[PDB]
Structure 1
Amino acid sequence: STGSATTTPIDSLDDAYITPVQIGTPAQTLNLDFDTGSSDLWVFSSETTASEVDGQTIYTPSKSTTAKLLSGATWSISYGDGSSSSGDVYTDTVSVGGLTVTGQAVESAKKVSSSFTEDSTIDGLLGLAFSTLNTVSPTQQKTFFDNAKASLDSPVFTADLGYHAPGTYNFGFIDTTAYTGSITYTAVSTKQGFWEWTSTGYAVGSGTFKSTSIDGIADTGTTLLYLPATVVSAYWAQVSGAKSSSSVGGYVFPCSATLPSFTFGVGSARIVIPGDYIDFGPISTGSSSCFGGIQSSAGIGINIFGDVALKAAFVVFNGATTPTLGFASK
């Protein structure tokens, strides 16, 4: 079997991407943030504290003839951005782009932090990292991909994020029309539960390529590209008036600037992020100071190839016995 779903940026900056997911019988469609950096499928629901819902579509398990309470199961998660959610668990029928999993753990939120309430466009998360990160207790649960894997034509899913435009998540097949040239595959460590891999270096604009290993995670749930402070300083040094602002919380640049591209290596291959992709616009409405798309990973304790880097590529998440990543230009 296969599935194929369109993913749509939630706003004009590509802050995140929502994909419609069918839950239950009859189907309840919710717009979920597919997150290769986490392993919980959780939703706004009929159980979510009323004051903490502000325009989201909710899952109502009592209206689903296939929902069953997973008795005694709870979950609680804390993301890199300080946001959080928690609640109890149902099993139900979950379909993404025509691919159906029966008995999927659907984690129903009783509580969500302010950043979730404040985003009316995201109905929940669908994690696509390794199931060893799933937070359900006392019985850890499998991701949608882990449940689907055995039924898929090939044990893979692909992320084809758009720049200010819709993209695609495909499950169980590589669309050979969606990229140019060849896919370059690179080794993955699952030691941290992430799609963790080692980039072979970087270049800034038309600059020479610096050969250097950069360990990091491929994370569709993180907006920006977080890299070591050396690399990030080398990038913003090429932008007149760019500086790191304590008060704003990272690199800002004059909104009059033309930003240079950023290239990252995948083995002997090169993925070029156009300069436009690194522009996250004014820091506040009306400001001439703009927020950078490339930021320091210092403090975070890991490098993160977030949407700024991934949307420049056709990315293959190979869930074979020995998992690998694939990157192609497109």
Structure 2
Amino acid sequence: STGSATTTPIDSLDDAYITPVQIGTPAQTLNLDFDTGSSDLWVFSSETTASEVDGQTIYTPSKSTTAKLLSGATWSISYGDGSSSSGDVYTDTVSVGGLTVTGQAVESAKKVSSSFTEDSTIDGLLGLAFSTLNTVSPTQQKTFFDNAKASLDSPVFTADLGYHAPGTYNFGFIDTTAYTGSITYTAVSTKQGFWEWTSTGYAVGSGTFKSTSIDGIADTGTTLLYLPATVVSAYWAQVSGAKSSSSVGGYVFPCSATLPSFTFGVGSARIVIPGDYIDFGPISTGSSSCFGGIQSSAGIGINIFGDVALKAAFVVFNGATTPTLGFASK
């Protein structure tokens, strides 16, 4: 079996992408943020603190004939940006683009942090990293991808994010019409539970490619590209007037400047990120200072190939017994 769903940016800056997911019987449609950097499928629900809900569609397990309380199981998660959520756990039928999984753990949020309440477009997260990162206790739960794997034509899912436009998440097949050339595959380390891989280098604009190993994770749930201080400083040194601002929280540049492209290495292949993808607009309404899409990973401890990098390529997440990441130009 296969699945295919459209993913849409929540705003004009591509801060996050939302994908409709059907939960329960009869279906309750919620717009979830597909996150390859986490492993919990959690949703806003009828059990979430009423003051912490600001416009989201909520899951109501009491209206689902297939929902069941997973007695005694709880979950608690905290993300890299500081945001967090917690609550109890249900099992229910979950379908993504026609691909159905019965008995999926659906984590019902009782408490959500300010960041989630503020984002009215996002009803929850669908974790797509390895099930070892799942926060359900005492019994750990599997991700939707891990539960659908036996039923899939191929144990893969593909990410094809659009730049200020809709994209696609496919499960169980590789659309050979969605990319150009060939797909370059590279090894994945599952030691930390992420889709962790090694980039073979980088180039800034029309400059010479620098061959160096950058260990990082393919993360659909992170907006920006977070790379070592050395690489990020080499990039922003090519932008007139760009500087790292402590009050803003990273590199800012004059909105009138043109941004060079950024190239990253996948084996012997190169993925080119256009300069336009690195522009995140004014730091505040009316400001002439713009926020950069390439930031240092120094304070985080891990390099992140977020949506900025991922949207420049057709990305294959191969969840076979020996996992690999495939990259192709599009």
TM-score (norm 2): 1.00
Q: CA deviation at 1:120?
A: 0.1
Looking at structure 1, the residues matched to 31 and 81 of structure 2 have their Cα atoms a distance apart, in angstroms, of 20
Q: CA deviation at 1:185?
A: 0.2
Looking at structure 2, the residues matched to 238 and 5 of structure 1 have their Cα atoms a distance apart, in angstroms, of 39
Looking at structure 2, the residues matched to 183 and 36 of structure 1 have their Cα atoms a distance apart, in angstroms, of 20
Kindly report which structure 2 residues correspond to 1:286-325, keeping only aligned pairs within 5 A, or say none: 286-325=286-325
1:258-309 Cα shifts (integer Å, max 9, x gaps): 1000000000000000000000000001100000000000010100000000
SS at match of 2:55: coil
Runs of 5+ consecutive residues of structure 1 not aligned to the other structure: none
Kindly report which structure 2 residues correspond to 1:57-96, keeping only aligned pairs within 5 A, or say none: 57-96=57-96
Q: CA deviation at 1:39?
A: 0.1
Looking at structure 2, the residues matched to 9 and 16 of structure 1 have their Cα atoms a distance apart, in angstroms, of 6
Kindly report which structure 2 residues correspond to 1:55-204, keeping only aligned pairs within 5 A, or say none: 55-204=55-204
SS at match of 1:151: coil
1:72-125 Cα shifts (integer Å, max 9, x gaps): 000000000000000000000000000000000000000000000000000000
SS at match of 1:115: helix
Looking at structure 2, the residues matched to 11 and 288 of structure 1 have their Cα atoms a distance apart, in angstroms, of 20
Looking at structure 1, the residues matched to 30 and 123 of structure 2 have their Cα atoms a distance apart, in angstroms, of 6
SS at match of 1:150: coil
SS at match of 1:5: strand
1:180-232 Cα shifts (integer Å, max 9, x gaps): 00000000000000000000000000000000000000000000000000000
Q: CA deviation at 1:323?
A: 0.4
Paired position in structure 2 for 1:16: 16
Paired position in structure 2 for 1:208: 208
Looking at structure 2, the residues matched to 149 and 279 of structure 1 have their Cα atoms a distance apart, in angstroms, of 37
Looking at structure 2, the residues matched to 237 and 131 of structure 1 have their Cα atoms a distance apart, in angstroms, of 40
Looking at structure 1, the residues matched to 303 and 255 of structure 2 have their Cα atoms a distance apart, in angstroms, of 26
Paired position in structure 2 for 1:225: 225
Looking at structure 1, the residues matched to 180 and 278 of structure 2 have their Cα atoms a distance apart, in angstroms, of 22
Q: CA deviation at 1:53?
A: 0.1
Looking at structure 2, the residues matched to 9 and 25 of structure 1 have their Cα atoms a distance apart, in angstroms, of 27
Looking at structure 2, the residues matched to 165 and 72 of structure 1 have their Cα atoms a distance apart, in angstroms, of 42
SS at match of 1:88: strand
SS at match of 1:111: strand
Looking at structure 1, the residues matched to 226 and 103 of structure 2 have their Cα atoms a distance apart, in angstroms, of 36
The root-mean-square deviation of aligned C-alpha atoms, in Å, is: 0.3
Looking at structure 2, the residues matched to 286 and 45 of structure 1 have their Cα atoms a distance apart, in angstroms, of 37
Looking at structure 1, the residues matched to 193 and 37 of structure 2 have their Cα atoms a distance apart, in angstroms, of 8
SS at match of 1:235: helix
Looking at structure 1, the residues matched to 284 and 192 of structure 2 have their Cα atoms a distance apart, in angstroms, of 36
Looking at structure 2, the residues matched to 125 and 244 of structure 1 have their Cα atoms a distance apart, in angstroms, of 31
Looking at structure 1, the residues matched to 40 and 283 of structure 2 have their Cα atoms a distance apart, in angstroms, of 31
**Which runs of at least 4 in structure 1 moved beyond 3 Å after TM superposition?**
none
SS at match of 1:181: coil
Among all aligned residue pairs of Structure 1 and Structure 2, give the percentage whose two residues are the same amino acid: 100
Looking at structure 2, the residues matched to 284 and 58 of structure 1 have their Cα atoms a distance apart, in angstroms, of 31
Looking at structure 2, the residues matched to 95 and 325 of structure 1 have their Cα atoms a distance apart, in angstroms, of 24
Q: CA deviation at 1:168?
A: 0.2
Looking at structure 2, the residues matched to 257 and 139 of structure 1 have their Cα atoms a distance apart, in angstroms, of 52
SS at match of 1:147: helix
Looking at structure 2, the residues matched to 49 and 22 of structure 1 have their Cα atoms a distance apart, in angstroms, of 23
Looking at structure 1, the residues matched to 265 and 299 of structure 2 have their Cα atoms a distance apart, in angstroms, of 24
Q: CA deviation at 1:31?
A: 0.1
1:118-147 Cα shifts (integer Å, max 9, x gaps): 000000000000000000000000000000
SS at match of 2:150: helix
SS at match of 1:65: coil
Looking at structure 1, the residues matched to 198 and 290 of structure 2 have their Cα atoms a distance apart, in angstroms, of 30
Looking at structure 2, the residues matched to 256 and 212 of structure 1 have their Cα atoms a distance apart, in angstroms, of 32
Q: CA deviation at 1:327?
A: 0.3
Paired position in structure 2 for 1:284: 284
Looking at structure 1, the residues matched to 269 and 48 of structure 2 have their Cα atoms a distance apart, in angstroms, of 46
TM-score (norm 1): 1.00
SS at match of 1:321: coil
SS at match of 1:238: coil
Looking at structure 1, the residues matched to 238 and 180 of structure 2 have their Cα atoms a distance apart, in angstroms, of 29
Looking at structure 1, the residues matched to 68 and 274 of structure 2 have their Cα atoms a distance apart, in angstroms, of 47
1:297-322 Cα shifts (integer Å, max 9, x gaps): 00101000000000000000000001
